[PDB]
Amino acid sequence: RWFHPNITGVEAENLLLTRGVDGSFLARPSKSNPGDFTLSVRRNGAVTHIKIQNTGDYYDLYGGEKFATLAELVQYYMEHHGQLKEKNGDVIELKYPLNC
């Protein structure tokens, strides 16, 4: 499913660009923050990367709605395509999970 425990950020880009479409996304372990996770999302033919905060009390994207589990966070943003914006602003839609 959408969770890939064994890939890097670069590997995530290669997958999405070769096996995904615009709107495809996956979750993977974080390099900058070992033990954490990161969303890798494809849009406009390019791959973008969103940090997932795990406080031990909840999951979020260092802001926005808080979630008890990683899966529910992902579920929420798949169901609310307008909630994840950069400050540009531009929307980043989690549409299609790229399965493992």
Binding site: S32, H49, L61, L84, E86, I92
Partner: peptide, 11 residues
């Protein structure tokens, strides 16, 4: 090698 991360506006 190290990849791009977005600045988000969420709150």
């Amino acid at each position: 090698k190290q990849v791009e991360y977005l600045d988000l506006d969420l709150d």
